[PDB]
From a paper:
At the cytoplasmic face of the NPC, Nxf1•Nxt1-bound mRNPs encounter the cytoplasmic filament nucleoporins Gle1, Nup42, and Nup214, which specifically activate the DEAD-box helicase DDX19 to remove Nxf1•Nxt1 from the mRNP8. DDX19 is a member of the DEAD-box helicase family, which are RNA-dependent ATPases composed of two RecA domains (referred to as DDX19NTD and DDX19CTD throughout the text). Gle1CTD plays an important organizational role by providing spatially separated binding sites for Nup42GBM and the DEAD-box helicase DDX19/scDbp5. A comprehensive structure-function analysis of DDX19 indicates that binding of Gle1CTD•Nup42GBM induces a conformational change in DDX19, thereby stimulating its ATPase activity.
Author numbering:
A (entry chain C): 212 to 311, 312B, 313 to 529
B (entry chain D): 494 to 557
Write the structure that this text describes.
């Protein structure tokens, strides 16, 4: 199902990147531009976390210019079937801007670079300062929803989600023990040079990815002529999978991701779901911590968050 | 917060959008989905847990 396909997408993207390097050995125009385009996307994404609305809009325009150049394919890179990088195969749609059955590999490649850079900003910056996820998320949603970058009526955001599934599996319903090797692998516990990262580094990754997932799944397109490429139903579904876990299978990983999905995103959650969001917050921050057998600092942080919501924003989840 | 707090500022609920509803609305006529949401419509909160399918917008209110 979706799991299998996202794994296949993730490995198709690996081979695409290898094949871009192979092309550059025989394509001089590709060789002369490909590296600079990659570096300019990564640099621009890296400047979002430390910038204001106007500066961030400029970085977004820069990325859109590079992707526009890639789509025109003046470097004459090989073409590829984009169905290798979306969950469900797409057939032509009437009125769509781009119904071509093939896209330039340089274009797909740089979407992948863009998605990889966004993921890295969540991990490296939102892990310490979760507030920095929001501008990265805005940029992701703005770029992927650009009418010129839609393929057969919908965005290519499956390239980003395929990677999210790798690095934060709990957002997609996966569970495991932090005390077993198989469990750490199911939870996305990362490795650095073959050895498990520290628990503290693992929880920082989960914090940044929790906040980054919310940043891309809780965006407002009502006042925009663009379509939402990853709408809030996916936020609702992800939170539900976490908060319905049987008590024996609950891990601090889930609780850390959950706090990061929620904190600072309550107002947006309520805007989309109103009173249903209140009931879901009650489940996430009152019922879920109460029925967790191992009362950890991670479990307790969810309860403290409920207290703060009541003391600060005046929201009564009880 | 000591006194009454008003959360929703706009005048009335947001305009209808399918983006918050289930990807395929054919699931709302399933007995399973109806049962998950039955408790919410009645009591206004989740008892058996959070429904895995997001609500229809008609089931939500924004007057608080
Ligand atoms: O996530 P993994 O399955 O462990 O694979 C990683 C990952 O690539 P993916 O984007 O395909 O996941 C790294 O990317 P980041 O997470 O850092 O974005 C990439 O490193 P680069 O940053 O250099 O692209 C690295 O590739 P490499 O081994 O060439 O450094 C590659 O490892 P694999 O060789 O196992 O695919
Ligand atoms: O050559 P790789 O094994 O693929 O490693 C690269 C390389 O890192 P190191 O040379 O320091 O090991 C990149 O550095 P540059 O050559 O671009 O300067 C670094 O990029 P940043 O230093 O800009 O972060 C990138 O990491 P990232 O995933 O952030 O792009 C990292 O890739 P991996 O360690 O993930 O393989
Ligand atoms: O596509 P939208 O979601 O409606 O985004 C609009 C749109 O952006 P583009 O410049 O990319 O097209 C506006 O431009 P027009 O499409 O109407 O030409 C732009 O305003 P400008 O007219 O100044 O380009 C505005 O940006 P801003 O709110 O800063 O005026 C921006 O909104 P978002 O950046 O919030 O999506
Ligand atoms: Zn890397």
């Amino acid at each position: 199902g979706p799991h299998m396909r996202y794994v296949e997408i993730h490995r198709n993207l690996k081979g695409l990147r290898k094949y871009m390097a192979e092309q550059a050995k025989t394509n001089l125009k590709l060789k002369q531009r490909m590296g600079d385009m990659r570096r300019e996307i990564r640099k621009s994404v890296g400047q979002l976390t430390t910038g204001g609305m106007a500066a961030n809009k400029d970085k977004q325009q820069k990325i859109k210019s590079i992707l526009t150049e890639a789509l025109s394919n003046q470097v004459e890179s090989a073409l590829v079937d984009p169905n290798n990088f979306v969950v469900e195969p797409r057939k032509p749609v009437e009125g769509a801007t781009n119904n071509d059955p093939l896209l330039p590999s340089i274009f797909v490649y740089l979407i992948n670079i863009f998605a990889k850079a966004a993921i890295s900003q969540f991990i490296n910056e939102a892990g310490a300062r979760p507030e920095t996820a929001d501008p990265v998320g805005i940029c992701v949603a703005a770029i992927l929803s650009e009418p010129d970058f839609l393929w057969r009526g919908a965005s290519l955001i499956d390239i980003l989600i395929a990677k999210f599934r790798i690095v934060c599996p709990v957002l997609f319903g996966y569970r495991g023990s932090e005390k077993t090797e198989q469990g750490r692998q199911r939870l996305g516990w990362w490795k650095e040079s073959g050895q498990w990262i520290s628990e503290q580094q693992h929880m920082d990754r989960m914090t940044g990815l929790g906040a980054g997932f919310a940043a891309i799944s809780l965006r407002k397109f009502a006042l925009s002529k663009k379509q939402n490429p990853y709408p809030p139903r996916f936020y609702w579904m992800a939170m539900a999978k976490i908060v319905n876990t049987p008590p024996a299978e609950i891990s601090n990983t889930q609780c850390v991701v959950l706090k990061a999905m929620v904190q600072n995103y309550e107002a947006k959650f309520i805007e989309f779901y109103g009173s249903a969001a209140i009931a879901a917050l009650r489940t996430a921050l009152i019922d879920f911590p109460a029925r967790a057998p191992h009362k950890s600092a991670a479990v307790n942080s969810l309860e403290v968050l409920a207290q703060m919501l009541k003391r600060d924003t005046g929201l009564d989840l009880g | 917060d000591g006194t009454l707090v008003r959360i929703w500022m706009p005048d009335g609920a947001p305009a209808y959008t399918a983006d918050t509803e289930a990807e395929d609305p054919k699931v709302y006529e399933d007995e399973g989905v109806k049962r998950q949401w039955q408790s919410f419509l009645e009591k206004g909160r989740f008892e058996g847990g959070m429904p895995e399918v997001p609500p229809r917008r008609e089931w939500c209110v924004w007057d608080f």
